[PDB]
Write a protein that binds this ligand. Structure first.
Ligand SMILES: [Ca+2]
Length: 399
């Protein structure tokens, strides 16, 4: 079968469980579309009721920040009449406003401005859908694909810069406050049976060191790359290339969402992470199989300095095998970050700068996660991961 008709292998990760992930492979010829702009894309997807098997080919670059006549939309097109960044900055300055959540005129105007952008950039993908990039240059710029449905395949697309024009100031986030934005490249919100393969994720032509700092904190226009929340389950992410971005992948959005326990069954394999700061992934609750991935970065980078790879969150059950990390000077314990409620991690074959390490033992965690992965393809030796991943991961390697 061709790229549009290929399905997830019967043993290829948690996405292969139960009914498996076949996307729109059973589509008739009338439900095979070739799209090259936002209008064609939204028309082919249809609404939530469009559950008929469908195959969508993305040809060329699709900019999501455009109006219905395909005219590019910027800051001034989305801005609410009352919103003014200079007035926003003056109103919520920590020295005069304090550490309380922004409220009043400028925050209400900013929120309305954000909703104007949300309407163009966020699109929902209906059940039984395959979205694949045509050739080696298929790109989605500015969009946020949201998957709340079952049985979806997304492959061979470069997703760039899911950019929020109106970041919100949150003085209570962390120790010194932080600027927060709303859009990811892909948001899995309760979606099941999903395969994300051979895609590339980056911040395009607007990386984070092109943003100024306000209140001593970077004015952050980005959020996640591939995030999963609210009971998302049975997902395989393979051969993806994540690079030049801060917060990559958050699986499980909150410590109080106890209904995520038993869900968030995700398999990550053969992915490349280059110049990724943190959360790759950060996990709460889920049984996540992480194998044959390659992480490379530098703690002294001037754009995206490495902080940590795996985030061991509340009740997480990460099972990691033969992963390779190349970050000069990093100690074994600092490859991961442990959060309250995180007490277990299984890791075998971890290579840090050419030497075998045990991340779990270095952090005093238990190795008993209560499960062993049953669905997986062949496992590469740690010695061959770097070459395999650099040569095969990312969009444009297939077509
Ligand atoms: Ca997110």
């Amino acid at each position: 079968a061709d790229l549009g008709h290929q399905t997830l292998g019967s043993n290829d990760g948690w996405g292969a469980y139960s009914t498996g992930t076949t996307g729109g492979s059973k589509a008739s010829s009338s439900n095979v579309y070739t799209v090259s702009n936002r209008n064609q894309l939204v028309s082919a997807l249809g609404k939530e009721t469009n559950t008929t098997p469908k195959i969508i080919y993305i040809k060329g670059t699709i900019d999501m920040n455009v109006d219905d006549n395909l005219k590019p939309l910027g800051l001034n097109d989305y801005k609410d009449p009352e919103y003014d960044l200079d007035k926003y900055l003056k109103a919520y300055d920590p020295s005069t406003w304090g550490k309380k959540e922004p409220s009043g005129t400028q925050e209400e105007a900013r929120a309305r401005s954000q909703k104007n952008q949300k309407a163009r950039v966020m699109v929902d993908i209906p059940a039984n859908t395959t979205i694949v990039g045509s050739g080696t240059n298929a790109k989605v710029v500015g969009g946020n694909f949201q998957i709340k449905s079952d049985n979806v395949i997304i492959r061979n697309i470069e997703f760039q810069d899911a950019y929020d024009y109106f970041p919100q100031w949150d003085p209570t986030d962390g120790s010194s406050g932080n600027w927060n934005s709303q859009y990811d490249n892909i948001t899995i919100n309760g979606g099941t049976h999903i395969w994300i393969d051979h895609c590339t994720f980056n911040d395009g032509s607007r990386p984070d060191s092109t943003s100024p700092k306000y209140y001593g904190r970077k004015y952050q226009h980005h959020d996640g790359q591939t995030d999963a929340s609210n009971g998302a389950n049975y997902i395989t992410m393979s051969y993806n290339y994540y690079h030049d971005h801060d917060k990559s992948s958050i699986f499980g959005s909150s410590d109080s969402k106890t209904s995520d326990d038993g869900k968030l069954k995700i398999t990550l394999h053969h992915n490349r992470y280059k110049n990724i700061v943190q959360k790759a992934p950060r996990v709460r609750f889920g049984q996540v199989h992480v194998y044959n991935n390659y992480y490379e970065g530098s703690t002294s980078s001037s754009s995206y300095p490495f902080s940590y790879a795996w985030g061991i969150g509340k009740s997480s059950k990460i099972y990691a095998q033969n992963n390779v990390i190349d970050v000069p000077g990093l100690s074994a314990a600092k490859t991961i970050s442990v959060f309250s409620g995180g007490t277990a991690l299984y890791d075998s074959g971890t290579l840090l700068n050419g030497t075998q390490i045990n991340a779990s033992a270095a952090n005093g965690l238990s190795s008993s996660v209560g499960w062993t992965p049953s669905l997986h393809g062949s496992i590469d030796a740690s010695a061959n991961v770097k070459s395999n991943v650099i040569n095969q991961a990312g969009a444009g390697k297939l077509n």
